[PDB]
């Protein structure tokens, strides 16, 4: 039927327009490979008489790229550290933000290797918190299909030397997920709102 001519136009249009997308994406991506100005988004939702952006450049200037001409305001929220065109003065692409000096890596261990077998004594408590934490990590879909959201806040209270730290790192290793350690006693900083 019309399908032969239709698909003859369809494959050509799809491939040629994806080639055009590749061309535009490369011409913008070498600029995305040379972004220079920080993105302090003073977000003004200028709907066209849809959105817009005010970018505070690293060189202390303001660029009002219209309607955020390359990226979507859903993923680009008012913040910082998102690629900005050095020549086109336009929001180029998102990039990881800055984790507040100390929290960039305060004491974050990428992966603990301590095993559950080397600790013990409180095996009932450790199995309880394993069910409450590690199971919501491995079998998270189990809780999801059950309909019960697992609790998050677990408070290990007890005299020092009872293995809370080792148990926590071992649990994180069993989850095989990210582990972030907070040094509580030194969270009391003189700086206002620092903690």
């Amino acid at each position: 039927k019309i399908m032969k001519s239709e698909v003859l136009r369809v494959t050509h249009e799809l491939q040629a327009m994806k080639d055009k997308i590749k061309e535009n994406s490369e011409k913008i991506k070498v600029n995305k490979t040379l972004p220079y100005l920080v993105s302090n988004v003073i977000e003004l939702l200028d709907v066209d008489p849809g959105k817009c952006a005010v970018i505070k450049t690293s060189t202390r200037q303001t660029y009002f790229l219209p309607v955020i001409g390359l990226v979507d305001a859903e993923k680009l929220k008012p913040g910082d550290l998102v690629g900005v065109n050095k020549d086109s003065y336009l929001i180029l692409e998102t990039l990881p933000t800055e984790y507040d000096s100390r929290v960039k890596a305060m004491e974050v261990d990428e992966r603990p290797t301590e095993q559950y077998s080397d600790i013990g004594g409180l095996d009932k408590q450790i199995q309880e918190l394993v069910e409450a934490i590690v199971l919501p990590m491995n079998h998270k879909e189990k809780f999801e299909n059950l309909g019960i959201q697992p609790p998050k806040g677990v408070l290990m209270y007890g005299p020092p030397g009872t293995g809370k730290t080792l148990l926590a790192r071992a649990c994180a290793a069993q989850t095989k997920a990210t582990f972030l350690k907070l040094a509580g006693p030194q969270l009391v900083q003189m700086f206002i709102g620092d903690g």
Partner: protein, 48 residues
């Protein structure tokens, strides 16, 4: 000018804080492999 580097993506791109306060990302020069450059080390940049 020479500025320190901040960090990078999985491999190719490098997200860098630059002494010009710049949110600087570049394709590392072809003569320089990404292995040699490490986070928090100072590299000079060709103005062009």
């Amino acid at each position: 000018c020479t500025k320190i580097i901040n960090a990078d993506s999985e491999d190719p791109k490098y997200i860098i804080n630059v002494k010009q306060f710049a949110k600087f990302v570049v394709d590392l020069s072809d003569q320089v492999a990404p292995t040699d450059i490490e986070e928090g080390m100072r590299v000079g940049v060709d103005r062009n």
